[PDB]
Amino acid sequence: DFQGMLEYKREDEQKLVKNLILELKPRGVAVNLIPGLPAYILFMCVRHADYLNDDQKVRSLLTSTINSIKKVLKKRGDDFETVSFWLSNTCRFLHCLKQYSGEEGFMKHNTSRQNEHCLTNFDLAEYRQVLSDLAIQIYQQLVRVLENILQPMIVSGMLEHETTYTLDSILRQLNSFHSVMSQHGMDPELIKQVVKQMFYIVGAITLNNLLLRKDMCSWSKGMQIRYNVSQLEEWLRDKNLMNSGAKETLEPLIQAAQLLQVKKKTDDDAEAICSMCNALTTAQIVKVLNLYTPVNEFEERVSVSFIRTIQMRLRDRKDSPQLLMDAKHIFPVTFPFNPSSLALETIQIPASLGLGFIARV
C-alpha cells in the first residue's frame, strides 16, 4: 500500500514542472481519462515535502508551480483549450489544498482515508490566497479569449442572418466551449458562470446593434430575434444550465424583441409596454419605438403621441438616461469549495507524462 505521496529529487524539480506544467498538452490520453491529474500529482508532491518537514522544498515547488502556470498562459494565452485546462487545474489544486489542509471546515465531505492524507507540518493558507488570485486572473483571460472568438459571430448570426456566421455557428461554438470545459473536469459551478458570461456577451452585443442600426427594428426582426433566443434557451435546457443565470442575461434582448412584435396603437397598448419592458431603460424603450419600421401599408407608423404617452408614464421611474449595454462587462467570478472523492493512495503516474523520475510513496 502507498500513502498517496510523490517523491522527487530536488535537482529534478525543474524537469518536473517542465513536463507537468510548461510542456503538458491540455488534450491527451491521461488527462482526458483522469481530469485534474496534474493538480492531483502536484499536491501529492507537496504532501511528500510537507512530510519531510522541508520548508524550502515546499516553498520552492509552490513557487515554481505558479510561475510555470503564468509562463504557459503568457506563451499560449490566446488558446482557449490551454487557458481552460489551467483554470480547471489551478482550481483542483486549490480544492486539494483546502480538502487536505487539516482545517475541519474543509473536511466535512472527506472519507476517513482522505482525512489521513492531510498536511501535517505546514499551513498553506497564504499560498491558497495567492493561488485563488491566480485563478481569478486566469478566468479573466478565459473570458477574454472566449469573447474574441464569439464577438465576430454575434451580429451576423443573431441579426443579419435570415431563416457567413449563422445562429448555428454560434451554437456550434458554444458546444465546443462547453465540451472542452467538461473534458477538463472544470467545476460545474464554474462552467455555469462561464456560460452566463457568454450569454451576456451575446445579448449585449445583439441589443446594442438593434439600438445603433436603423434597419433592425421591424416586426420581422422581433420575430427572428425571439426565435434565435428560443434556440439559445433550448441549448441551456439540453445541457441542464437553466439555473446558471444565463437565460436572465438575455431578458433585455427578449423584452426588446417583444416590443417589436406587440401592438403599438392604443393607450392600453402603451400601458402593457410600460410593464412588460421592466428590464429596458426608458431611453432604450423610446429609442426602439422611434427606429420602428412598419411591415406593410396596413400597419401604420408608431405615432409621436403614442411615444410621448409612454415617455410620460415612465417618468415616475428612477431616471435612466442610458442606451448601450457594456458588452465588455465581466461578472465577478467565485470558486466555491468542491472536494473530490478521488483517493490519492491509488493514483498512478502514466508513462505518457514523462515523469518516470518521480516515485510513489
Binding site: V58, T63, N67, E126, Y127
Partner: peptide, 14 residues
Amino acid sequence: KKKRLLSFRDVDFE
C-alpha cells in the same frame, strides 16, 4: 502541534 504558516508575498513570484 500547530502547523507552521509559510509566508507568501508577491516578492516571491516572478
